[PDB]
Write a protein that binds this ligand. Structure first.
Ligand SMILES: [Zn+2]
Length: 401
């Protein structure tokens, strides 16, 4: 409906356009006097729509994520398999699964708007003596076959496979700009095939769920959206990870998880959010207004992208200033509209009522490319009421242990 999901396949050759050889963003990460990721291979990467890249490789780029074998005390909801995503055939499956998920998200107007937002929400650039331009942390390196850089490419969201634990999913904001008002790209680590399941008792009381459903599997497009929403916050420089936390039901859940998950729990932390909001908005004003007002060319594309990312940003060349009420409204709208709960409703899939869970029922494997399992329009519920296509009992969900 607005972005187009490119039809790419793993075996398609590098074309230096949508299919590139990518050097990882954290290639030069120094942790504790070690260059953690030196000599990691350059990776085949697929731009599935502007500035969103899929890389069918295991995420092994923090030092906690280097060993694919199980640790000493593995969680009961973890699963380890060093061979997952090692062959080219598996990378194609992964790429095709990711493409199907994006098409699902793109199946409604709200998901179209979301993907557009990811596509266009540039991190704010740096001033360079008159010249506003992208900094080195705001681009990925496109490489030849020999370790030389051919050029620098924009990236907003990079999706990789899981780390050691096939079941774990998440968003890694590249830099501290995630919370400074400037923003940064996010690396997501995600398996479309390996999922945790939840009791329907964890679903809210209003839920339309069939009574034969004891235990359900989340729609992988909705789970992907959860992580893309962290992504989006990182692009807007409004990550709430260090802004505060709340103790539920107890255990501590940071504001970033709460606002991302959506639903009722948002009301509990609202008073705390409202104290902090002025500061966040001010970091936004303070970061973007000086930058944009350096641009002396009215046809500058940065100008346009900034005004498009922040419609609250008004004025004329050299003299752009936020509308303070509007910017507050628009940021709050990001959280209120773009969150997991709202996207579950929007794609009509069952999710749970609360981010924190007491336990996982099962861990399962499912291939959404297989015949009769998953459609763009309905995910697991093609021709099902009460979300029955998401019950663990379906032939397409295999329990692991
Ligand atoms: Zn999260």
């Amino acid at each position: 409906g607005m972005v187009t999901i490119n039809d790419l396949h793993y075996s398609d050759p590098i074309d230096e356009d949508n299919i590139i050889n990518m050097r990882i963003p954290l290639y030069d990460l120094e942790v504790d006097d070690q260059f953690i990721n030196h000599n990691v291979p350059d990776l085949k990467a697929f731009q599935v729509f502007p500035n969103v890249w899929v890389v069918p490789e295991r995420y092994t780029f923090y030092s906690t994520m280097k060993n694919l074998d199980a640790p000493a005390n593995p969680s009961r909801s973890s699963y380890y398999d060093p061979t997952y995503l090692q062959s080219d055939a598996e990378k194609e499956v992964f790429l095709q699964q990711m493409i199907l998920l994006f098409k699902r998200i793109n199946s409604t107007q709200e998901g179209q708007q979301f993907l557009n937002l990811l596509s266009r929400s540039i991190p704010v650039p740096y001033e360079s003596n008159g010249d506003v331009a992208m900094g080195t942390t705001q681009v990925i390196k496109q490489m030849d076959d020999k370790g030389n850089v051919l050029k620098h490419r924009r990236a907003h969201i990079i999706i990789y496979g899981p780390g050691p634990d096939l079941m774990a999913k998440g968003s890694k904001a590249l830099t501290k700009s995630r919370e400074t008002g400037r923003g940064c790209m996010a690396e997501i680590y995600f398996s479309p095939m390996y999922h945790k399941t939840y009791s329907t008792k964890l679903t809210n009381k209003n839920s339309l769920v069939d009574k034969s459903v004891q235990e359900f599997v989340p729609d992988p497009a909705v789970t992907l959206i959860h992580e893309l929403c962290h992504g989006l916050h990182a692009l807007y420089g409004i990550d709430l990870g260090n802004v505060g936390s709340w103790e539920f039901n107890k255990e501590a859940v940071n504001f970033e998880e709460v606002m991302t998950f959506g639903g009722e729990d948002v009301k509990v932390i609202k008073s705390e959010i409202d104290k902090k909001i002025p500061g966040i908005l001010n970091l936004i004003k303070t970061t973007v207004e000086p930058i944009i007002n350096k641009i002396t060319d009215p046809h500058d594309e940065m100008l346009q992208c900034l005004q498009s990312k922040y419609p609250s940003l008004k004025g004329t060349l050299g003299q752009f200033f936020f509308d303070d009420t509007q910017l507050e409204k628009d940021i709050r709208d990001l959280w209120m509209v773009m969150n997991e709960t709202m996207f579950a409703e929007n794609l009509k899939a069952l999710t749970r009522a609360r981010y924190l869970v007491p336990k996982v029922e099962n861990i399962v494997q499912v291939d959404i490319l297989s015949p009769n399992v998953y459609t763009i329009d309905k995910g697991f519920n093609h021709l099902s009421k009460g979300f029955k296509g998401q019950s663990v009992s379906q032939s397409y969900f295999r329990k692991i242990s």
